[PDB]
Write an enzyme that holds these catalytic residues in place. Structure first.
Site, PDB file in Angstrom:
ATOM      1  N   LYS A 215      -3.260   7.559  14.762  1.00 25.39           N
ATOM      2  CA  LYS A 215      -3.661   7.143  16.052  1.00 25.39           C
ATOM      3  C   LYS A 215      -4.655   5.960  16.152  1.00 25.39           C
ATOM      4  O   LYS A 215      -5.431   5.820  15.413  1.00 25.39           O
ATOM      5  CB  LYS A 215      -3.970   8.254  17.166  1.00 25.39           C
ATOM      6  N   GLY A 373     -13.855  15.447   7.405  1.00 27.36           N
ATOM      7  CA  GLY A 373     -12.279  15.538   7.707  1.00 27.36           C
ATOM      8  C   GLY A 373     -11.376  15.143   6.607  1.00 27.36           C
ATOM      9  O   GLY A 373     -11.679  15.560   5.521  1.00 27.36           O
ATOM     10  N   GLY A 396     -15.924  15.475  13.139  1.00 20.79           N
ATOM     11  CA  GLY A 396     -16.033  15.016  14.383  1.00 20.79           C
ATOM     12  C   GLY A 396     -17.340  14.339  14.852  1.00 20.79           C
ATOM     13  O   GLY A 396     -17.585  13.186  15.425  1.00 20.79           O
TER      14      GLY A 396
HETATM   15  N1  LIG Z   1       1.767   6.080   7.921  1.00 23.77           N
HETATM   16  C1  LIG Z   1       1.528   7.269   8.624  1.00 23.77           C
HETATM   17  N2  LIG Z   1       2.382   7.862   9.413  1.00 23.77           N
HETATM   18  C2  LIG Z   1       2.092   9.100   9.695  1.00 23.77           C
HETATM   19  N3  LIG Z   1       0.967   9.603   9.729  1.00 23.77           N
HETATM   20  C3  LIG Z   1       0.144   9.057   8.853  1.00 23.77           C
HETATM   21  C4  LIG Z   1       0.167   7.770   8.216  1.00 23.77           C
HETATM   22  N4  LIG Z   1      -0.993   7.739   7.534  1.00 23.77           N
HETATM   23  C5  LIG Z   1      -1.658   8.627   7.645  1.00 23.77           C
HETATM   24  N5  LIG Z   1      -1.251   9.521   8.659  1.00 23.77           N
HETATM   25  C6  LIG Z   1      -1.529  10.821   8.848  1.00 23.77           C
HETATM   26  O1  LIG Z   1      -3.004  10.438   9.719  1.00 23.77           O
HETATM   27  C7  LIG Z   1      -3.766  11.922   9.662  1.00 23.77           C
HETATM   28  C8  LIG Z   1      -5.140  11.456   9.933  1.00 23.77           C
HETATM   29  O2  LIG Z   1      -5.281  10.874  11.241  1.00 23.77           O
HETATM   30  P1  LIG Z   1      -6.308  11.055  12.085  1.00 23.77           P
HETATM   31  O3  LIG Z   1      -6.391  10.171  13.085  1.00 23.77           O
HETATM   32  O4  LIG Z   1      -6.034  12.425  12.677  1.00 23.77           O
HETATM   33  O5  LIG Z   1      -7.473  11.283  11.310  1.00 23.77           O
HETATM   34  P2  LIG Z   1      -8.466  10.263  10.601  1.00 23.77           P
HETATM   35  O6  LIG Z   1      -8.959   8.938  11.460  1.00 23.77           O
HETATM   36  O7  LIG Z   1      -7.785   9.805   9.212  1.00 23.77           O
HETATM   37  O8  LIG Z   1      -9.814  11.112  10.190  1.00 23.77           O
HETATM   38  P3  LIG Z   1     -10.344  11.751   8.720  1.00 23.77           P
HETATM   39  O9  LIG Z   1     -11.320  10.884   8.289  1.00 23.77           O
HETATM   40  O10 LIG Z   1     -10.444  13.121   9.061  1.00 23.77           O
HETATM   41  O11 LIG Z   1      -9.231  11.504   8.028  1.00 23.77           O
HETATM   42  C9  LIG Z   1      -3.470  12.547   8.518  1.00 23.77           C
HETATM   43  O12 LIG Z   1      -2.964  13.731   8.576  1.00 23.77           O
HETATM   44  C10 LIG Z   1      -2.224  11.771   7.754  1.00 23.77           C
HETATM   45  O13 LIG Z   1      -1.194  12.635   7.266  1.00 23.77           O
END
Ligand SMILES: Nc1ncnc2c1ncn2[C@@H]1O[C@H](COP(=O)(O)OP(=O)(O)OP(=O)(O)O)[C@@H](O)[C@H]1O
Length: 416
Positions: A215, A373, A396
């Site tokens: 996101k 995370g 978090g």
């Molecule tokens: N191209 C993509 N399409 C869909 N999901 C994705 C893609 N790249 C990464 N992800 C998913 O994004 C998730 C992580 O996103 P989220 O925003 O929840 O965390 P984050 O900002 O990555 O935090 P952290 O440092 O904990 O990883 C992972 O579970 C991963 O599978």
């Protein structure tokens, strides 16, 4: 300044009772601990106290999400006590509660060198200040009871030590309510504050931030704040498809798209240019026909677009090269979020390759910091926890720090 907080090494504990808040929220599959990483992490702080003549060390922590009611059958810390004893080599007295006359009495004058572990703080709604009844209805804690809970915790020791960075972004009783003349961070907290102090106070340059995840909307303040301190930024993961669609008019198929975030993208790029920040986005991708570990795989670039019914799940070889060039120029790196669906091997190669590059950079002197995370989990999977400068223990919490907020638990610590 995160660097001016009191830490355990600067605290005299000789003959003192030490009440220590630790992070023992370990993973369990019912009747056993699958990962004791968290427990092994607290050992240095505990041993230091005992080795420096502390009268006792009272350990308090939470486990799971009891939500304010006692759930010993599911989230009791008893198993942790047994696990801690084997790791420390000393007996551990486990108490069935964390507050009350019985508990205060056991802690009033324990046998020298005693290590006591109290039961799940979250079995009481006064710790979080909120919870749920057996019916699932929201219950808010009573002020007078919160006062009584904190007064009780405060009676269990003479000095307070906080080594639970993972909960420091929460104004819970065990974080901000223990009223003792000395509130110091423990060794784990010391590391968190020392490295993030670099990421936000005096970083080495060039400073590169690698931002991944799915996101965009919930990461707006993080990007905003990082754009005020970095020299270069890699924007990957699912997040990039919102950027690519808006700026390049790229066809992204069924890949993640953040409608909300999409309206702020040009503005983010604008701030980037105004600050002289170089943005690196992916140029190619590994695609899948469905969001599943066994989906069919394809390949695509920004120019070709992504076929309808297909989604980008990882970056391609050309992106990895660009990513590695950015890592090559940096003297400091902060990485938050995977660059692809690292949970599935078919789409974890982009993330693995970057980890390899980051470990290499570390060897030549680069300060590499990995957020908590998922990304932090990445280090555990490929066993690179000891190949980078710092792997944050707070998901978090590290995020809120990077956003520029003041953590309640850090704020309550004594100043040097
Ligand atoms: N191209 C993509 N399409 C869909 N999901 C994705 C893609 N790249 C990464 N992800 C998913 O994004 C998730 C992580 O996103 P989220 O925003 O929840 O965390 P984050 O900002 O990555 O935090 P952290 O440092 O904990 O990883 C992972 O579970 C991963 O599978």
């Amino acid at each position: 300044s995160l660097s001016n907080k009191l830490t355990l090494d600067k605290l005299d504990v000789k003959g003192k009772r030490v009440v220590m808040r630790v992070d023992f929220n370990v993973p369990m599959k019912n009747n056993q601990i699958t990962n004791n990483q968290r427990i092994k992490a607290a050992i240095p702080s505990i041993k230091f106290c005992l080795d420096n003549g502390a009268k006792s060390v009272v350990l308090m922590s939470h486990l799971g999400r009891p939500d304010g009611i006692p759930m010993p059958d599911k989230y009791s810390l008893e198993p942790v006590a047994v696990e801690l004893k084997s790791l420390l080599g000393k007996d551990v007295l486990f108490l069935k509660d964390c507050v009350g006359p019985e508990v205060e009495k056991a802690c009033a004058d324990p046998a020298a060198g005693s290590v006591i572990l109290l039961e799940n703080l979250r079995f009481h709604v006064e710790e979080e200040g909120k919870g749920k009844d057996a019916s699932g209805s929201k219950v808010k804690a009573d002020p007078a009871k919160i006062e009584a809970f904190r007064a009780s915790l405060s009676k269990l020791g003479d000095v307070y030590v906080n080594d639970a960075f993972g909960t420091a972004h929460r104004a819970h009783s065990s974080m901000v309510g223990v009223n003792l003349p000395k509130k110091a961070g423990g060794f784990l907290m010391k590391k968190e504050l020392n490295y993030f102090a670099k990421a936000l106070e005096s970083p080495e340059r060039p400073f590169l931030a690698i931002l991944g995840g799915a996101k965009v909307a919930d990461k707006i303040q993080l990007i905003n704040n990082m754009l005020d301190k970095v020299n270069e930024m890699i924007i990957g993961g699912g997040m990039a498809f919102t950027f690519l669609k808006v700026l390049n008019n790229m066809e992204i198929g069924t890949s993640l798209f953040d409608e909300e975030g999409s309206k702020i993208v040009k503005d983010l790029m604008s701030k980037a240019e105004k600050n002289g920040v170089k943005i690196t986005l992916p140029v190619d991708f590994v695609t899948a026909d469905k969001f599943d570990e066994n989906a069919k795989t394809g390949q695509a670039t920004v120019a070709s677009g992504i076929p309808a019914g297909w989604m980008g799940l990882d970056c391609g070889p050309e992106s990895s090269k660009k990513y590695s060039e950015a890592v090559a120029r940096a003297k400091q790196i902060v990485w938050n979020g995977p660059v692809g669906v690292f949970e599935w091997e078919a789409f974890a190669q982009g993330t693995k390759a970057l980890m390899d590059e980051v470990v290499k950079a570390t060897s030549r002197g680069c300060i590499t910091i990995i957020g908590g995370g998922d990304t932090a989990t990445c280090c555990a999977k490929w066993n690179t926890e000891d190949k980078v400068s710092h792997v944050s223990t707070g998901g978090g919490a590290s995020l809120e720090l990077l956003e520029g907020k003041v953590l309640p638990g850090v704020d309550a610590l004594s100043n040097v």
